Design a binder for these strands. Sequence first.
RNA 1: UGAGUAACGCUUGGGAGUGAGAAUCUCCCAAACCGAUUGACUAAGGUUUCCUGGACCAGGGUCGUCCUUCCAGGGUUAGUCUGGACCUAAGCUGAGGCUGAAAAGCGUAGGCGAUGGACAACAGGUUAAUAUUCCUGUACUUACAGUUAGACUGAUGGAGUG
RNA 2: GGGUAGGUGGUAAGAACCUCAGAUCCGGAGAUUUCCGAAUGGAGCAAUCCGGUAGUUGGAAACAGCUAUCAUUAAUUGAUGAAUAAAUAGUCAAUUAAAGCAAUACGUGGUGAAGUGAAACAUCUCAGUAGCCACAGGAAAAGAAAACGAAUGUGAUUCCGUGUGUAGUGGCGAGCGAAAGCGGAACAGGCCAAACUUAUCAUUAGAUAGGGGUUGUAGGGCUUGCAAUGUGGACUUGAAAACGAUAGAAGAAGCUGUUGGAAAGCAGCGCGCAAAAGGGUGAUAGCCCCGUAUUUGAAAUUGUUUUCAUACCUAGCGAGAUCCCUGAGUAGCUCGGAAAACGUUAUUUUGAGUGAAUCUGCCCAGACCAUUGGGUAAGCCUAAAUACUAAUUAGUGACCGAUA
Lengths: 95, 64, 110, 111, 204
Amino acid sequence: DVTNVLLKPVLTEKVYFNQMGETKKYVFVVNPKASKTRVKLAFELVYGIKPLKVNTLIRKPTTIRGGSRFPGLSKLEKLAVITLPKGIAISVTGE
Amino acid sequence: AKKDQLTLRGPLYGNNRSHSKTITRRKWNVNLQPCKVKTADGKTTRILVSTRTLRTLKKHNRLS
Amino acid sequence: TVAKELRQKSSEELVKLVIKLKGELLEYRFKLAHGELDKPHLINQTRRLLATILTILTERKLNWQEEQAKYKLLTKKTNEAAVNAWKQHLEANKAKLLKSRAKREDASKK
Amino acid sequence: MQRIKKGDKVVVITGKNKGGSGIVLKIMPARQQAIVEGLNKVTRHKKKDQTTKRAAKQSTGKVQQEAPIFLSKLALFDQKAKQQTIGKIKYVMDPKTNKKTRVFKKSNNTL
Amino acid sequence: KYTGSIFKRSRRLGFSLLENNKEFSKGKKRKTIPGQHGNRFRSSTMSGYAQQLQEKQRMQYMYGITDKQFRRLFRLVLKQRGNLAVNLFRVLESRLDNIVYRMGFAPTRRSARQLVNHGHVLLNDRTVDTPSIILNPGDKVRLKAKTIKIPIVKAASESGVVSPFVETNNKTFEGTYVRFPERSELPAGINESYVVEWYKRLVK
RNA sequence: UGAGUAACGCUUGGGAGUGAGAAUCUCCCAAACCGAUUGACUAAGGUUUCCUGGACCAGGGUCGUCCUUCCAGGGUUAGUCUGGACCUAAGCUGAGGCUGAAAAGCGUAGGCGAUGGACAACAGGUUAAUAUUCCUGUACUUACAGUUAGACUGAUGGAGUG
RNA sequence: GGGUAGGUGGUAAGAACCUCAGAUCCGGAGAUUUCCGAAUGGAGCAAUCCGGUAGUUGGAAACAGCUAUCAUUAAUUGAUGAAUAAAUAGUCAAUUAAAGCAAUACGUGGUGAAGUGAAACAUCUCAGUAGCCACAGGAAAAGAAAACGAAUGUGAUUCCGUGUGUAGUGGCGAGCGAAAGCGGAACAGGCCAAACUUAUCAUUAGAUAGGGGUUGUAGGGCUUGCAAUGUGGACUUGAAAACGAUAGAAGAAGCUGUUGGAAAGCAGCGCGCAAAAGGGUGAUAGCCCCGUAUUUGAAAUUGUUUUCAUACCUAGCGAGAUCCCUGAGUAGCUCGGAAAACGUUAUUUUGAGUGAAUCUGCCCAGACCAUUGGGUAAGCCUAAAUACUAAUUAGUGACCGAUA
Ligand SMILES: [Mg+2]
Ligand SMILES: [Mg+2]
Ligand SMILES: [Mg+2]
Ligand SMILES: [Mg+2]
Ligand SMILES: [Mg+2]
Ligand SMILES: [Mg+2]
Ligand SMILES: [Mg+2]
Ligand SMILES: [Mg+2]
Ligand SMILES: [Mg+2]
Ligand SMILES: [Mg+2]
Ligand SMILES: [Mg+2]
Ligand SMILES: [Mg+2]
Ligand SMILES: [Mg+2]
Ligand SMILES: [Mg+2]
Ligand SMILES: [Mg+2]
Ligand SMILES: [Mg+2]
Ligand SMILES: [Mg+2]
Ligand SMILES: [Mg+2]
Ligand SMILES: [Mg+2]
Ligand SMILES: [Mg+2]
Ligand SMILES: [Mg+2]
Ligand SMILES: [Mg+2]
Ligand SMILES: [Mg+2]
Ligand SMILES: [Mg+2]
Ligand SMILES: [Mg+2]
Ligand SMILES: [Mg+2]
Ligand SMILES: [Mg+2]
Ligand SMILES: [Mg+2]
Ligand SMILES: [Mg+2]
Ligand SMILES: [Mg+2]
Ligand SMILES: [Mg+2]
Ligand SMILES: [Mg+2]
């Protein structure tokens, strides 16, 4: 509802491999506390096309910048894979 | 605990002196004896109390 | 300075402002994530103005989500292509469903 | 108020540059410095770096810029006086506009 | 340490011993306690000294003094020349705030002391913040100008009212004196001298 | 100093290539060991050590253009799999309550607690890294609403099975 | 509010902005404040999982958003209500408080060793220390004589010096060690119960709510008169004023030459000071800069004190009656312990037992009796001087200067 559970879309080789061939699959990063239903609701209120299904990924924090004078940890990411129906392809940028 | 319910007087810790004045810690316990009384419509309720309160209870006409 | 103009504004117009700025903030963050935000300071300005609007809206004992939930306007435009895809998907699903049930039924009869 | 502002004429009273006239372009209050144009010209040995659209060329040879100067070494320059001289300034408050204005103490010149 | 239930035990007896010691009936007395204590006196039969004692309280109270300070001042004046029944009167009346109140720029003696402590007060060969310095018969006490800058002014009027042993000119804020207060200017509120002999017994 | 001494902790030859530099890196051909295992899938644990490209400060008992080392980027998709939303064993906690100088101990009703019980998905393909999870094909299960036909519905409790 | 012409926190340049309708910055007052954590809807392997209820918005419902609430204990109140008629236990609901933490520090209380010394060791010492636990507070504790004590005596408690290493106490060994008095810091004494009386409780009151009373050269009550309308508090609300605290404003006085990379050093001639504390400025500056002395200033919050009024308390000296009240399982005594300097004993306290009297009364003055004298137990509260510094501001050091 508040639509703070859609932080940033991410574009990688896996993402672009999916974003072709009839059904498109768009991968965003979402609030780690959000649920699948909240992700679908956010997509409903801000895009307008009902996802066919939603898959979720949790990327665990790991050590980064190892050996550097001050080492630091990573940030917890939850990934969401929206899949729109046949024949529909909306743009992530431009509204 | 081993204590009266009417008052709050409890055990008294002291020394066990013997010949040669050898020191060993000992405990004096209060005389918790069951007693039944009539309070609030004479409602009898068994209460573990010290013999001193029992004597106090006997003279104060409560115990009848 | 800016807060005075906002103070003159009513509450209903203010919640319209907050939802509009929320949408623009989402768009700015998305454009930044695509490397298409020439002006990267509008994100901060949007957030400060958003924070200010919250302060004026929280001065009065009024919320920002509930007030817009009471009255609102629905959506549009993003319906035509959406219903086409859904109609196409359900027709194919029902066609597959019908074919499967027929195959099973005629197989059991034989 | 401040002894030195961005814009007023200033000279140097100690160092190699004596009577060094310039215009203050910017003031760092925290480090008590002041960049004055034409004075303390240093020439950094400009390397070559190519990692950006602008860095693809980044033509930099013997660029001479401005080094910051301690605010103590600076002194305000008089202009209204017929005989320009170096002096100290006050912080009088004129009731005409109720705004603080610097005035020299060896003369009666504002700012 | 359990369900003591004060109702259960208190009612359990209704008299006993502990209930009556504690008896919630226990009122407040939050004014009886303070006020009567406050300060007392009277004269008795067996010791006589009761009159002397009461007079000391009055005398000490007239100037707002703690008994310890009084013992110091008596010790100072005691040793000197002789029958000093004329000296300690000047000593007791030499208080700066007493002179400030008797000078007439304050409604009450304690208010003058507060003023003195708050730094209103300018002296001659010195200045003054502490409201206890013992002053000399012929001394001036020029009042500050900031105090007049705070016109409450009502004071100056009292100054002229005055009593003959003080000579002060109104508005001009200045004061001195001579011919130290005779016993007439020390009225019958406290006028006795056998409390004086009492202090030799209590103070050597 | 011992002392450039002991030691360097089970596995060969060649051809071509990269590179400033190759017994040690890449490819190929052989060769030798494992083969109830040095083969393959996982539990526990480890916690990015996984894939790509680059580097040879440091570490690799030599060397190194190379590494499980470092840098940058990327990688883990479940109604049906493993566990919760289901159940209990040992045991733990445990309102009341009992006991005890105090802290506390014991313990009822309740609640936790798998190493057990109940529960619906298989085959193939795909990326450098994921796959009963993604894709194709064919299925199954549980809820809610509408509808058609039939039927009186029958538990927090009793009994059987488990 | 102050205050300006710069700002976008450090390793940090650059890119992009903000800012003279007064930015950044400082001070006062507010807003937001995820999850765990006393954690408190239930659980749980902390920062996780699973919910109920009452609303409201979408859906055709399941459902999903957005809000508020849901722990336990104690007290009060109300409703309901067992064995068992009544009545309670119990159950439910509402309201009010409690939970926890820290200041490696001070207080009180409970519990409480040992190393060690005695040249061994058991009495003893260590030591009522360490530790464990409970409760606080800004201090806490103590406190107004049934007292000291030997006198024509002092007259709450607390703290410091002396009395003194004295009297004493100690396998009379190691050791331990006051209480008077004196000199000082501060100083403050109040209030209930009972008599007597009023009103009400099936008035069996022996209970509730008021008036009266708070003692020792005895006090109070009973009856009867005179004098009183005050003085003072450990005291409530207000109003006013003053002194501060939390940002700040103003704030004097120098050039020349020389060595030198650089002058502020050195030299010449000057100047200011209620400012010659300090810091920086390319060496060692009273007069280059920031400051310092001094004079000042607060919209808002807050501290201390004073004045005025205002609630609430507070009042003397007689006469007669000869009557009543003055704190009971209490003080004593016995059996085991302890506190005091005392290794148990006149004084204080208590685990077990017993147990008094009522101003011609009771306790005390180191066993005890008599005389004399002192004091009024078995009810409560009490500022100040006293103990400490995690923190805030200013400052100091014949304290340290990277093995300290
Ligand atoms: Mg998953
Ligand atoms: Mg011992
Ligand atoms: Mg060696
Ligand atoms: Mg060697
Ligand atoms: Mg050898
Ligand atoms: Mg050899
Ligand atoms: Mg060898
Ligand atoms: Mg080897
Ligand atoms: Mg080999
Ligand atoms: Mg073989
Ligand atoms: Mg193997
Ligand atoms: Mg690693
Ligand atoms: Mg690899
Ligand atoms: Mg590589
Ligand atoms: Mg090597
Ligand atoms: Mg599937
Ligand atoms: Mg379970
Ligand atoms: Mg299992
Ligand atoms: Mg693999
Ligand atoms: Mg402002
Ligand atoms: Mg021993
Ligand atoms: Mg020994
Ligand atoms: Mg106290
Ligand atoms: Mg200034
Ligand atoms: Mg100056
Ligand atoms: Mg200097
Ligand atoms: Mg006795
Ligand atoms: Mg002892
Ligand atoms: Mg007597
Ligand atoms: Mg008595
Ligand atoms: Mg160190
Ligand atoms: Mg070192």
